[PDB]
Amino acid sequence: GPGSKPFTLPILTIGELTNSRFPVPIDELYTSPNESLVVQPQNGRCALDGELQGTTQLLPTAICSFRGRINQKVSGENHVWNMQVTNINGTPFDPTEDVPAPLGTPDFSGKLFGVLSQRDHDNACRSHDAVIATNSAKFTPKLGAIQIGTWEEDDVHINQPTKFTPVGLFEDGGFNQWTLPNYSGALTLNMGLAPPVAPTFPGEQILFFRSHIPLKGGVADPVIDCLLPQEWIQHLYQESAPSQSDVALIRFTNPDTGRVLFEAKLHRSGYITVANTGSRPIVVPANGYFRFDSWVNQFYSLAPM
Amino acid sequence: GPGSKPFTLPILTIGELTNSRFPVPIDELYTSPNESLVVQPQNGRCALDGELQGTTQLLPTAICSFRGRINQKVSGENHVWNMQVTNINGTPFDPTEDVPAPLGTPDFSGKLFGVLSQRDHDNACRSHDAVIATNSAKFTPKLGAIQIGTWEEDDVHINQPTKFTPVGLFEDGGFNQWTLPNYSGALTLNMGLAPPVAPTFPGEQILFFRSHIPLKGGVADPVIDCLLPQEWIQHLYQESAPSQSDVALIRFTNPDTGRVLFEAKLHRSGYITVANTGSRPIVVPANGYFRFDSWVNQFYSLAPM
């Protein structure tokens, strides 16, 4: 009609949200100033009008997963395999397409721990622990191939349907959630990226949805922070509501109480800022959720958290 | 107002749906007659008005997961541990609550393969392969405890936060997707169950959303069939639209083509029937999705598939 469809978010509490950058539930909200770090995740990217960006796709369980077939054991390597990757649904990946990598590809540097599974054309199956170094020169998903390490020296089959189910990190050394992999390998620039995000208003910081992820060994508390929960992305994709301005004011509210705990800016490009100093984890009532209040601009002065 | 909010389903193709009974994408639609088998899944259960039933909860990645802490190594057992389970968000499980088990508990009998991870209070971490026999007398999630098997004899810590990430089945022997676990263990009846479902109209069969799941070893093609995709459940929970009759007519349609491929009955209790003979897998265009057409009754004669 003459009027626009009102923008909406799903009615979901902190305990009903999934991380859009790793297939686990959100544990908490978190805010910190990115003085040195540049924030440019490729998963969990979606404009408020429902446009998916970067490597973002809709399936929460498939985030950081891989699909394809093993073409060979890597030359001069025991326990390392070369995997030709397809899209998550099994359809061929189109390397010339204007995305950084197959949708769902991990968007952080480190050693990912998970399980490699196969079901051969004759239905003979196997699953073994595996590691994928997203920070290695031979991590080339954009070119259609990655390398996968196993402990099992021999029991991986060639030219058979293969999946990688992510579990967590193998080790904490070399892990940086904000360092993008080189999707095309060494000496090649990433392309088709979702843009970096930063709080434009002096005094604001990004608000993240944070998950603490598993670690195979070591002493650490590795976390993955996403800009938007996967359910919000799924919702925005469904709704495709036009954005009335560059910023939607949202209010975190407990429904039974009816009281608003704090307010934040949801930006058109798909991330949240708040007025806060330093980095502190945010604990919120299990009943509470973000409610859309109105459209404002970048110059709107938020109430301090 | 005086009028009811129109019922709706999400606009999602086959490749954009998640299984509600195991944390993997839907691979295909499937239909078969349950002449001998009784269909009573506890996950992926939701009335069309958004009422969650059985052990159904909202987080797709958390389906078939467990959370809690290891209290002891099992008496007379090497490699077997007793785990005191909490809810998925970590909050205490209320055994007296009218559910069959903690929400998200697996609803099938067999040996589940996955990874057990821990992060100790001092941040020392470990992850190891694990198996959970949902078909054992010591599987007692409703009582607040299960047993977990590992290969690692010693490297599991007591009284530390623990998670189980499911991957697939350990073996195919003993697996039956329609046999419910005894949630309270041997000699105790399940309670608070979602009711069994069956096609009431002579000549109809249930239509399932089917996934082929990983297997650690053996020759088999184990599948998990759900009544509703997880995204539909999330959507119905959000919408909470009143049901106008016992049956909603839905039409599977490819949007670009604009052509309807077939029609089905979406029942108020949350499952689909079609008019088909025997068991056959259904392949549908990647563009296609179910569209809600109108409300009918049990006596509506569907066009044959």
> In sequence order, what DSSP letters do the residues of B105-137 get, joined into one string?
---SBSEEEEEEEEE-TT-EEEEEEEEEETTST
Determine the Cα–Cα distance for residues A163 and B220; give it in Å rounded to an integer: 16
Structural contact between residues B88 and B103, judged by C-beta atoms closer than 8 angstroms: yes
d(C-alpha A259, C-alpha A247), whole Å = 22
- The CA–CA distances, whole Å, from B218 to A126, A130, A155, A272, B204 equal 7, 19, 13, 48, 34
**B-chain residues near A167 (CB < 8 A):** 115, 117, 127, 165, 167
Give the span between the Cα atoms of A39 and A180, in whole angstroms: 10
* Cα–Cα distances in angstroms (integers) from residue A40 to residues A196, A197, A277, in the given order: 4, 6, 21
B88 vs A218: CB contact, 8 Å cut-off? no
B interface with A, Cβ–Cβ below 8 Å? 10-12, 15-16, 18, 23-25, 58-62, 88-89, 91, 113, 115, 117, 119, 122-127, 129, 163, 165, 167-168, 212, 214-221, 231, 234, 238, 286
H-assigned helices in B25-179: none
Residue in chain B nearest A10 by alpha carbon: B238
What count of Cα atoms within 13 Å lies in the side-chain half-sphere of residue A84?
Answer: 11
Taking the C-alpha atoms of residue A2 and residue A300, their distance in angstroms, rounded to an integer, is: 27
Residue of B nearest to A114 (CA): B115
- Backbone phi and psi for residue A292, each to the nearest 5 degrees, phi listed first: -75, 130
B16 phi/psi in degrees, rounded to 5: -125, 20
d(CA A3, CA A13): 30
* Yes or no, beta carbons of B16 and A220 under 8 Å apart: no
For residue A89, list chain B residues with Cβ-Cβ distance below 8 A: 15, 25, 286
CB B61 within 8 A of CB A64: no
Residues 6 or more apart whose CB falls under 8 angstroms from that of B237 comprise: B46, B50, B52, B58
Q: Which residues of A touch B217 (CB under 8 A)?
A: 125-127
B214/A115 touch (CB, cutoff 8 Å), yes or no: yes
Cα–Cα distance for residue pair A217/A60, rounded to 1 Å: 25
Q: Which residues of B touch A289 (CB under 8 A)?
A: none
N- to C-terminal Cα separation, chain A: 39
Residues of B in contact with A217 (CB under 8 A): 125-127
Q: Give contacts of A255 with chain B, Cβ < 8 Å.
A: none
Q: How far is residue B23's CA from residue B20's CA, in Å, rounded to a whole number?
A: 7
- Cα separation, A68 vs A294, in Å, equals 45
- The DSSP code sequence of B214-242 is -BSEEE---EEEESS-HHHHHHHHHH-PP
* Domains defined along chain A, listed by start: 1-62+171-305 (2.40.510.10), 63-170 (2.40.30.120)
Token digits of residue B156: 């599991």
In chain A, which residues touch B (CB < 8 A)? Answer: 10-12, 15-16, 18, 23-25, 58-62, 88-89, 91, 113, 115, 117, 119, 122-127, 129, 163, 165, 167-168, 212, 214-221, 231, 234, 238, 286
Q: Which of A61, A67, A122 to mutate to test the interface with B (most CBs of B within 10 A)?
A: A61
Q: Which of B15, B59, B127 sits opposite A16 (nearest CB)?
A: B59
Q: Which residue has the tokens 């041997």?
A: B186
Token pair, residue B107, equals 């609803």
Please list, in sequence order, all residues whose beta carbon lies within 8 angstroms of the beta carbon of residue B70, skipping any fewer than 6 positions away: B81, B82, B83, B84, B118, B148, B156, B157, B158, B159, B160, B162
Measured in degrees and rounded to the nearest 5, phi and psi for residue B88 equal -60, -35
DSSP secondary structure letters along chain A: --SPPPP------GGG-B-SSSSSB--EEEEE--SS--B--SSS-B-TTS-B-TT--S-STTTT-EEEEEEEEPTT-SSEEEEEEE-TTSPBP-TTSSSSSSTT---SBSEEEEEEEEE-TT-EEEEEEEEEETTSTT-BGGGTEEEEEES-SS---SSSEEEEEEEEES-STT-BTTS---TT-TT----SPPPPB---STTEEEEEEEEE--BSEEE---EEEESS-HHHHHHHHHH-PPPSSSEEEEEEEETTTTEEEEEEEEETTTEEEEE--S-EEE---TT-EEEEEEEE-TT--PPP-
What is the distance in angstroms between the Cα of B86 and the nearest Cα belonging to chain A?
A: 14
Distant-in-sequence, close-in-space partners of B2: CB < 8 Å, separation ≥ 6: none
Cα separation, A106 vs B16, in Å, equals 19
Across the interface, of B91, B123, B127, the residue whose CB is closest to A219 is B123
Which residue of chain A is at minimal alpha-carbon distance from B237? A11
Alpha helices (H) along chain B:
230-239
Tokens of A181: 């992999």
Of B43, B56, B165, B224, which to mutate for an interface test with A (greatest number of A Cβ within 10 Å)? B165
**Which chain A residue lies closest to B125 (C-alpha atoms)?**
A217
Residue among B202, B266, B204 at smallest CA distance from B229: B266
Cα–Cα dist B6/B241, whole Å: 7
**CB distance B165–A16 less than 8 Å?**
no
Residues B103, B92: Cα–Cα separation, whole Å: 12
* Residue among A80, A81, A55, A79 nearest A69 (CA): A81
d(CA B95, CA B103): 11
Which one, of B95, B166, B89, B99, lies nearest residue B134 by Cα?
B166
Two tokens, residue B91: 């909050």
Residue with tokens 């105790």: B188
Dihedral, CA atoms, A57, A162, B175, B39, nearest 10 degrees?
Answer: 30
Task: Measure in Å the smallest separation between the Cα of B188 and chain A Cα atoms.
Answer: 31
The shortest CB-CB distance from A218 to any of B125, B216, B231 is to B125
- Cβ-based contacts of A215 with chain B (< 8 Å): 117, 119, 125-127
Only one residue has tokens 């434009």, namely: A200
Amino acid at A184: S
Position B35, amino acid = E
Expt. technique: X-ray
Tell me which of A63, A113, A119, A226 to substitute to probe the interface with B (most B C-beta atoms closer than 10 Å).
A119
**Contact predicate B129/B150, CB 8 Å:** yes
Q: Which residue of A has its CA nearest to B24?
A: A61
